[PDB]
Amino acid sequence: PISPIETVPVKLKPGMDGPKVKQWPLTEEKIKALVEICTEMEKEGKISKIGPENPYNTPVFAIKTKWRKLVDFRELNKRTQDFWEVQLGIPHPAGLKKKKSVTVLDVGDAYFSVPLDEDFRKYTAFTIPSINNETPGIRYQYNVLPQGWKGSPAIFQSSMTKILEPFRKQNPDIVIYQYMDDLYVGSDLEIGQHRTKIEELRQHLLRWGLTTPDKKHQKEPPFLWMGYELHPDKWTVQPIVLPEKDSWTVNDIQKLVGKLNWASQIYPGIKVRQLCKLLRGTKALTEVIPLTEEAELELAENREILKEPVHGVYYDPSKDLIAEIQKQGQGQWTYQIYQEPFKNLKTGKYARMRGAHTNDVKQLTEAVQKITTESIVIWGKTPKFKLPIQKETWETWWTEYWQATWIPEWEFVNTPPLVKLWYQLEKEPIVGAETFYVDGAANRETKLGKAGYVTNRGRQKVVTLTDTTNQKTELQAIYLALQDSGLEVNIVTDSQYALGIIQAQPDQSESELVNQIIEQLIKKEKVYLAWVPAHKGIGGNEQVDKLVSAG
Amino acid sequence: IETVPVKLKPGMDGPKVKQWPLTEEKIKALVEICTEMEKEGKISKIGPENPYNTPVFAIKSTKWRKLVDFRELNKRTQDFWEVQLGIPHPAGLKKKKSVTVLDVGDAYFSVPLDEDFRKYTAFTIPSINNETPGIRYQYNVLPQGWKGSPAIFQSSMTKILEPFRKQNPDIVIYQYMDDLYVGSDLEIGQHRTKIEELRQHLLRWGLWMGYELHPDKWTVQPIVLPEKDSWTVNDIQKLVGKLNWASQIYPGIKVRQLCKLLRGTKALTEVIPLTEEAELELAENREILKEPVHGVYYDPSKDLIAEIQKQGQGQWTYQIYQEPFKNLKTGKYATNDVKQLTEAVQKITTESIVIWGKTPKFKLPIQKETWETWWTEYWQATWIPEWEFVNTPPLVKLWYQ
Numbered sequence: 032p033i034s035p036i037e038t039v040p041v042k043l044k045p046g047m048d049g050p051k052v053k054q055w056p057l058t059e060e061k062i063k064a065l066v067e068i069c070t071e072m073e074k075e076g077k078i079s080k081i082g083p084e085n086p087y088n089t090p091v092f093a094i095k096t097k098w099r100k101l102v103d104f105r106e107l108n109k110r111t112q113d114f115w116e117v118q119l120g121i122p123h124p125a126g127l128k129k130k131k132s133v134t135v136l137d138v139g140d141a142y143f144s145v146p147l148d149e150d151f152r153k154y155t156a157f158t159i160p161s162i163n164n165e166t167p168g169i170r171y172q173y174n175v176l177p178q179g180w181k182g183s184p185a186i187f188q189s190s191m192t193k194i195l196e197p198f199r200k201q202n203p204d205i206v207i208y209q210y211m212d213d214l215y216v217g218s219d220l221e222i223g224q225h226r227t228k229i230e231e232l233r234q235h236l237l238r239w240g241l242t243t244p245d246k247k248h249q250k251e252p253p254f255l256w257m258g259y260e261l262h263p264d265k266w267t268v269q270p271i272v273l274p275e276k277d278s279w280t281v282n283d284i285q286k287l288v289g290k291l292n293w294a295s296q297i298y299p300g301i302k303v304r305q306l307c308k309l310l311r312g313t314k315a316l317t318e319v320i321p322l323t324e325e326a327e328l329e330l331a332e333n334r335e336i337l338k339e340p341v342h343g344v345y346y347d348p349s350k351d352l353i354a355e356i357q358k359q360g361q362g363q364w365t366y367q368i369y370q371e372p373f374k375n376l377k378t379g380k381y382a383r384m385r386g387a388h389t390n391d392v393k394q395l396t397e398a399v400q401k402i403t404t405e406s407i408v409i410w411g412k413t414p415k416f417k418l419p420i421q422k423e424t425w426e427t428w429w430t431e432y433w434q435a436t437w438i439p440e441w442e443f444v445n446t447p448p449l450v451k452l453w454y455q456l457e458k459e460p461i462v463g464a465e466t467f468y469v470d471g472a473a474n475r476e477t478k479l480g481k482a483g484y485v486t487n488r489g490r491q492k493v494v495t496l497t498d499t500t501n502q503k504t505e506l507q508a509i510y511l512a513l514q515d516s517g518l519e520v521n522i523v524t525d526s527q528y529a530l531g532i533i534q535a536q537p538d539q540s541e542s543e544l545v546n547q548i549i550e551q552l553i554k555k556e557k558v559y560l561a562w563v564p565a566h567k568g569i570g571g572n573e574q575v576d577k578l579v580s581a582g
Numbered sequence: 583i584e585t586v587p588v589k590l591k592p593g594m595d596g597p598k599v600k601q602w603p604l605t606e607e608k609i610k611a612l613v614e615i616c617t618e619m620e621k622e623g624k625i626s627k628i629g630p631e632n633p634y635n636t637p638v639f640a641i642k643s644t645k646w647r648k649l650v651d652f653r654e655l656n657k658r659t660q661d662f663w664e665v666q667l668g669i670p671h672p673a674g675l676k677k678k679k680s681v682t683v684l685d686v687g688d689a690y691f692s693v694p695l696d697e698d699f700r701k702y703t704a705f706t707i708p709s710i711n712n713e714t715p716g717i718r719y720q721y722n723v724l725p726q727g728w729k730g731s732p733a734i735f736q737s738s739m740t741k742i743l744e745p746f747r748k749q750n751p752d753i754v755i756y757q758y759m760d761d762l763y764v765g766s767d768l769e770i771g772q773h774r775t776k777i778e779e780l781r782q783h784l785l786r787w788g789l790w791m792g793y794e795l796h797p798d799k800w801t802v803q804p805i806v807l808p809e810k811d812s813w814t815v816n817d818i819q820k821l822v823g824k825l826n827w828a829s830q831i832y833p834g835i836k837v838r839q840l841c842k843l844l845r846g847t848k849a850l851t852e853v854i855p856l857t858e859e860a861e862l863e864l865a866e867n868r869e870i871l872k873e874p875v876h877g878v879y880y881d882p883s884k885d886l887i888a889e890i891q892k893q894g895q896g897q898w899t900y901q902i903y904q905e906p907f908k909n910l911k912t913g914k915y916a917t918n919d920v921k922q923l924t925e926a927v928q929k930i931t932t933e934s935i936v937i938w939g940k941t942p943k944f945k946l947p948i949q950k951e952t953w954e955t956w957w958t959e960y961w962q963a964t965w966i967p968e969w970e971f972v973n974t975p976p977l978v979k980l981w982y983q
């Protein structure tokens with residue numbers, strides 16, 4: 032049928048006229064098939080014949096099985112107004128409430144069942160060519176949503192939403208999820224009281240031009256839905272098989288990380304890092320990558336987790352969400368979110384370096400922030416966290432750090448490894464500690480550098496480096512003070528950059544140097560680090576600067 | 583009435599801005615509110631043929647109020663609300679003893695909006711877990727939040743205030759977005775009595791910061807140089823850096839003398855005694871830094887930018903400037919970081935409006951996502967300034983108190 036629902040106005044893009052594409056001459060097979068498909072559509076009101084006054088055209092093709100009309104709306108789409116995105120996201124099983132019985136209905140010839148704005152129909156005109164293009168073709172245009180047109184998806188969904196509006200009001204108990212041609216219906220009614228309410232809907236949809244399949248052509252649990260396996264009072268992910276392969280191609284690793292990644296929504300502690308490292312370096316999709324020990328190490332740990340099935344629970348809007356995070360390695364965090372202890376709603380992982388250097392405490396907060404947004408999306412509320420960091424470690428960090436950081440309701444849970452800052456810089460200079468005025472120069476053109484220091488106890492060292500920048504040198508100069516120095520040291524520098532890095536208490540870096548420097552700072556008992564302006568003739572800055580200025 | 587035609591006009595197309603996620607309770611508040619607004623004919627459901635979108639949130643004391651982010655729309659309508667229907671800003675306003683901010687946005691709900699503009703005021707209430715498709719509306723009447731609304735209404739705003747202004751000629755009244763700024767050198771009870779008087783004019787016709795503001799009490803925070811009995815090498819270095827930085831904003835600063843003080847390669851802990859001239863310089867700089875910057879003037883054609891630094895222990899510092907480091911006002915503000923930060927942001931923006939008739943672009947020391955998640959929780963204004971996220975370079979922190 033063709034819903035009675037009022038149409039949606041549509042318009043071409045402002046500076047644009049409708050398309051006038053040439054119909055390439057077709058083969059007779061195809062001519063015949065089109066004529067055939069077109070009469071039948073014509074007979075159900077889907078298309079109407081038109082004259083040669085209508086000056087718009089699009090191409091038509093037919094592919095085989097049995098014949099199918101393919102129209103090419105490349106031009107009309109490029110030429111038609113933009114629209115609002117259909118759906119802004121896809122529900123997550125963790126967010127769903129449990130249901131006693133569910134039914135999945137499929138709408139038949141969905142687009143062809145919804146009318147096209149009269150004013151717009153003109154532009155959909157297309158032409159069945161005559162054998163060898165001797166004579167005028169047959170011209171038709173659409174009276175309904177065509178397949179492949181830019182507007183069909185959106186307009187269908189609005190239409191369907193308008194059509195459902197009343198029925199939902201009338202049936203607050205029941206729930207319906209609209210995606211594409213499909214409707215997904217559920218209730219906590221018992222199988223016969225449900226089945227009736229399905230019917231009121233099916234009739235309801237017919238009353239509006241939308242047909243569906245008959246009272247015993249409809250599924251029973253478990254439902255397979257958007258890669259999930261949905262059961263009435265639980266859910267998990269469609270079944271994951273990790274291949275046994277003696278040889279792994281890029282493509283094979285790519286797809287595996289995909290599956291593992293997908294798997295991590297419910298299986299705790301999936302890790303994918305060492306597998307992803309294999310993917311660095313642009314290699315062919317068919318190139319075989321030797322597994323490293325650590326990737327192999329990882330691949331088995333994943334297999335253990337997967338061997339026995341895991342399921343997740345649905346959401347209960349009366350209880351609170353509790354979210355736990357654990358550190359599962361360097362840069363690797365894993366979390367689980369639940370409402371009753373260990374009945375997991377969902378699971379997941381975070382492993383993201385923001386910037387160049389970072390510390391566990393920062394990472395934990397980034398992780399909290401990610402889960403917080405994620406919960407707003409799925410449950411409309413944020414959780415209570417259960418973090419592996421002492422309140423006092425957290426207190427120390429936030430107050431003395433210069434970025435604003437804030438995490439909501441939480442508690443320390445003792446689930447090691449614990450988050451800790453591994454060194455803290457002093458706040459005041461250290462008496463009876465040597466003072467290293469450090470510096471670094473680099474010729475911008477030879478790229479040689481010089482890294483050095485001078486001290487208040489007389490020492491002077493000045494090494495020579497090769498292909499490095501000003502930045503690297505002023506960092507090599509700090510590494511040096513920390514190597515040659517004792518357990519307590521004061522270190523003075525003119526680089527704001529170096530200060531930056533280090534003042535932030537990194538414990539992880541993308542620089543090998545900074546990782547050397549971190550090692551050193553962990554060994555010290557005390558460090559104090561101070562800054563002065565370059566080239567201002569300062570006591571001691573001036574002296575290292577001379578020593579370091581050849582090249 | 584008949585509706586003022588509006589235009590974006592060239593090849594700026596309207597706003598297509600994602601809707602940030604909202605908590606269950608905010609969403610509810612929003613449907614409760616928008617069912618009424620539809621009822622009263624203020625907004626209408628729209629269909630998919632409207633590709634435009636502007637984000638909305640809800641805010642609070644006891645009732646929820648709806649707030650819409652027209653930041654983009656404002657940006658893309660600039661020629662109309664600024665050059666084609668400008669509201670001049672009075673310089674007099676900061677000079678007043680007491681300024682009171684009054685919400686008048688409920689006025690704009692009476693004027694209708696140019697039918698061919700409405701499409702651009704589209705917003706979406708979204709749904710938990712993406713279960714439903716999310717209710718789409720658009721404005722039929724002037725919206726609160728869009729700088730076009732007071733542009734249109736000023737013709738009306740002027741008639742309403744005519745008598746009050748005629749009878750109170752030393753009271754200065756300024757309109758920024760949904761608010762009226764009302765300034766007097768009156769005594770407070772009088773200032774306050776005149777405010778009630780003003781409210782009643784409005785009531786026929788249809789209608790952090792504590793209470794009023796006090797712009798004549800708005801002195802900049804000097805860069806402050808510790809006074810010290812005793813000086814260490816460290817302390818001088820800190821002092822030299824802190825002055826050497828100040829030199830590049832303040833004309834007249836000198837350090838020479840203290841650099842003398844730092845002669846050799848010495849220990850930081852080592853103390854070093856104040857010179858004749860060294861001391862002389864210090865107090866001479868102290869003097870410069872107290873008085874504002876010589877050379878820096880507001881250019882209305884450049885954007886105002888605002889930096890903020892977390893000073894620890896509930897304290898924040900801030901600077902407004904157009905060209906970097908050339909400060910036009912510097913300041914200070916005094917239970918959790920984000921809350922405090924959003925208060926400072928509102929404070930700084932409020933002053934900024936009083937002084938220049940324009941909001942600053944903020945450089946916020948916080949992770950984007952933290953901020954986006956949490957800002958709406960404490961926010962209480964009806965505008966939203968523009969903002970970017972930035973890492974506070976750790977010295978600038980130090981150079982401001």
Ligand SMILES: Cc1cc(C#N)cc(C)c1Oc1nc(Nc2ccc(C#N)cc2)nc(N)c1Br
Nearest residue numbers: 127128129130208215216217254256261262263
């Ligand atoms: C009803 C339904 C079925 C399928 C499908 N397929 C997919 C979706 C998104 C569905 O919508 C919802 N389902 C549920 N819970 C739920 C509970 C059990 C089962 C099962 N078995 C399925 C869904 N809650 C909702 N609010 C919505 Br909306």
